[PDB]
Structures are given as C-alpha cells and as structure tokens.
Structure 1
Amino acid sequence: VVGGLVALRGAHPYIAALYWGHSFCAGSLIAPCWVLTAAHCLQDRPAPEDLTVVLGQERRNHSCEPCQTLAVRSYRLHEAFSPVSYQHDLALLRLQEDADGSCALLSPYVQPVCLPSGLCQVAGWGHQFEGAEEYASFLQEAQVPFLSLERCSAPDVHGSSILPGMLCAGFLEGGTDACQGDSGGPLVCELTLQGIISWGSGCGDRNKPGVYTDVAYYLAWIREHTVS
C-alpha cells in the first residue's frame, strides 16, 4: 500500500499470506477453515498441495511466535471470473485441518473478519509506491474512502472498465492505495470485509482510485460455497 503507515501487530488478525512456488498473494480469514482471496491469484491453477497459508504474520515471509502455518486442501475460483475484464475476481481457499479437526486456532492474533452485513482501512505487504523494488516488510495499512460506482465509472476516472461486482476506494486527488503485491488483500470498513484488492492503474495516481472485488455483491456465492 501507498501513503500509509506501519500497522499495529494485532490490527489485522484476519489477514492471511499465501505462498507457492515463486508466487505470493494475500487474503482474509472469513471462517476458521476458509480464506477469501482474489481469483486472479490462482488463475494459473497451482496444485493445492503446493500452497502454504500463514496466519498471524506481521513481517512478510517472517516466522513468528503467533504465526500459524497451514496447508491448503482445496480452492474454488468463481465460475464467472474473466482474466480479461477481471470481473468476478474472487476465490475461496479451504484450509487443511489437523488431527483434532481444527484449522486456524483462534487467538488475539488469528481471527476471522466479518462478512458485510449489507471510512475504510486497506492493508498489505506490497509496494509502498509504484515501481518499488521490494515488498514492505512490516504490514502497512492506510485509510481510504469508499467511492460511489457512478463516480468511479466516470470517463475521467475508470470508465467502461467498472463492471458489476467491482467497487472502488481512494482519494480522487490521489495518494493512498494498494499496489502490486497487495492482491487478495482486505478492504475493511464499518469492522467488516467489504472489498478484495484486485487491480487499478498505477498506485494512488490522481483520479485513479483502486478497484476491488465487492464482497457484499457475492454474499450468496460465498455462503453457498462456504458450507463445509
């Protein structure tokens, strides 16, 4: 994220890190055995066996005492995801349970985020400006406003690219936004998950708010594919 400050260690218990092969993504714990991420993260369909999920992390790829690591037993991409429009950009990760039948072991550092009931914080370990060389090390969060679809859609902003299922957030003046390395990241409002970090055009540029998957738009899909 761009324009933000280091997040408190306990501020984002729900956020999850996803590692496999040479790739990385973020997500949100929405139930003890379920992470919600972006479909474009798993576009290339890696094998569940190769995925590692880490909960309770503060420093990207850094082992820590509250950290909890989990295998991924399966995942479901939304059937209508388009790798062209990036519409319907969400996916569910079913975590692998241990012998007690538990996945995440909840604690002050590991807890699910509420799905929306139906001003915001964005969080992630990605680039602190566009073109940045490395990932943040400490988790960043920044506060960003919601943007009405009629104003995000306007032709000076994002235009025809804003489709059903997307939502926007940030200052039209620019400055605070997510970036590369923040995909699947949580947009948290009033605390509930209302967006998934999906795409934009250049981190925080003027007149270019970030584009997120609108989680409330997909409640029914999430309920349906989140039993079990």
Structure 2
Amino acid sequence: LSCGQRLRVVGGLVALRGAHPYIAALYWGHSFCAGSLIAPCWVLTAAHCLQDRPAPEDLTVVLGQERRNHSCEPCQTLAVRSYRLHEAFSPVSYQHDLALLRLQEDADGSCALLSPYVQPVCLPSLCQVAGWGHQFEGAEEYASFLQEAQVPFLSLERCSAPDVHGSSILPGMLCAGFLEGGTDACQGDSGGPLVCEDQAAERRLTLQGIISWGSGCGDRNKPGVYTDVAYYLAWIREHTV
C-alpha cells in the first residue's frame, strides 16, 4: 500500500517493529515526544511538545524503533530542517494542538526511506493508541518497548458531559477510550498516534488523532483527549507542500 501498510499507554500490550511503521520518536535534551510519519519528509506531532521552541538543529527523529533505548542498525535517524506549530495553539486550553516537522533531506532529496518497518500513515477522509509513555500515572519511567491499546471513539456529546470533560472539549478535539477507565494514553505519549483501520480502503492505517491531553491516565469518566486530524486536513495539506 501507498500509506497505512502494516507488517504485523495504560492497559496496552507490546507493539513490535512493523506494527506501527509510521511512528516517529522525537528527542532533544532530556525531552521526548512521539509523532507520525505522514509523508517521507513530514512528521505530524502535538504543538505542546515544542512550545518552549527548541532549535530545529537540537532535534533528532528516529523511525523504525521498537525500544526507545536501543541503538538499532535498520532504524533511521534524521535531522529536523524546520517545524511549524499550528498558529492558533493555545498553551492554556490546548486547542489547535498540532505541529509539522520537516525532516532534513540528504544530497539526493530523500528523507525517510520506505521499508517494511518504515511506512507513512494515511491521512483521514477498530482503533488504537500507541506510545512509549508511562504504563500508569505516577510511573517513574517511560515504557521500554512501544505499547499499543485498543480504544473506541467517544461522541462529543458524551465527552463534553459535565462529569467527563465539560466545556474543556473544544472544536478540533476528540475523545477516545472508555468511561469505565483502565485503557488510555498517559504522560509521555504526547504527539503520538490514534490510528484506525479503514474498512473502506483495505483496512489501511489512518491517523484519526494526535495524543494531546487528559485528566489522569485511565481514570473513570476521564478518557484521553486528542487533536482531530480530519478537522485540520486542509491546514496539514497547505503546510506540507
């Protein structure tokens, strides 16, 4: 497939190399974020990750990773040429929480080299959240292996009920997870993916959300909040020329 091809977090399971071939790991200083490869030279992440504005030269993007802490021969380490946060990102409400990283091309003009382990994810227009974050709130460390958990979409009417997130759910946000709790994104999953298998297009992986924020991790009535990728489609297409 052109995109969304696949080879093979609280309450998740290990996701081995090739399970999420589009997932990007972003490193700088003592900081970390995840993202999604949406094209050979582009990675979609959360804007809140880069709000302190590190220099693009201080960032490292790693594609093909399984373990966050292992050096790996087929993994691709790329420099970041530049990045663009959404111009309307609000550090107070987290509305418009999205950012694009332009990867540094080599002499020939290539960035990510596609392989069974590195593939772009499809853009939108059976769901899972993935990341290397804390496996529970209060964990002293990030997960060593990538984790994956199945979560369903929750309607805006249910996510904005007063006992859930109320008036904090704004245009551009979506919720996924369970009101019972147990399975969710957590601290350290920032910028990572919420992908769904597209039944209309051969079950290809389609990026529906970007891990943005939550009240706790896996708490009752507090599901994870994500940036609605479909809502920002024209912005992403405009800024990825």
Q: Provide the TM-score with structure 1 as the length reference.
A: 0.97
Helix, strand or coil at the partner of 1:41: helix
Shift of residue 39 of structure 1? 0.2
CA distance in 1: counterparts of 2:55 and 2:73, whole angstroms: 28
Describe the SS at the equivalent of 2:225. strand
Give the drift of 1:127: 0.4
Counterpart CA distance in 2 for 1:76 and 1:141 is 27
3-state DSSP class of the match of 2:208? Answer: strand
Deviation at 1:198, TM superposition (A): 0.4
Report the alpha carbon displacement of residue 49 of structure 1 after superposing the two structures with TM.
0.6
Report the Cα distance in structure 1 between the residues aligned to 2:100 and 2:51, rounded to whole angstroms.
Answer: 13
Following superposition, the deviation at residue 20 of structure 1 comes to 0.5
Question: What runs of 5+ residues in structure 2 fail to find an aligned partner?
Answer: 1-8, 198-205
- Per-residue CA deviations over 1:131-182 (Å, capped at 9, x if unaligned) read 0001100000000000001110000100000000000000111110011110
Find the aligned partners of 1:20 and 1:127 in 2 and give their Cα distance: 19
Output the CA distance in 2 between the equivalents of 1:36 and 1:77.
Answer: 10
Task: State how far apart, in whole Å, the 1-side matches of 2:16 and 2:149 are.
Answer: 12
1:18 matched residue in structure 2: 26
In structure 2, the residue matched to 1:137 is 144
Q: Corresponding residue for 2:85?
A: 77
Secondary structure in 2 matching 1:216: helix
Deviations 1:67-104 (A, max 9, x none): 00000000000000000000000000000001111000
Unaligned segments of structure 1, at least 5 residues: none
The alpha-carbon deviation at position 65 of structure 1 amounts to 2.4
Secondary structure at the counterpart of residue 102 of structure 2: strand
Q: How many correspondences in the alignment?
A: 225
Cα shift readout 1:97-123 (whole Å, capped 9, x = no counterpart): 011110000100001000012x31110
RMSD of aligned alpha carbons: 0.6
Task: Report deviation, 1:21.
Answer: 1.1
Q: For residue 201 of structure 1, what is the aligned residue in structure 2?
A: 215
Pairing 1:182–2:196 present = no
Question: What is the CA–CA distance in structure 2 between the aligned matches of 1:21 and 1:8, rounded to whole Å?
Answer: 26
> CA separation in 1, counterparts of 2:88 and 2:222?
26
Q: After TM superposition, give the deviation of residue 9 of structure 1 in Å.
A: 1.9
Q: Distance in 1 between matches of 2:117 and 2:18?
A: 6
How far off is 1:64 after superposition? 1.1
Give the deviation of 1:63 after TM superposition: 1.2
**Percent identity between the two aligned chains:** 100
Alignment partner of 1:94: what SS?
strand
CA apart distance, 1:61? 3.0
By how many angstroms is 1:8 displaced? 2.5
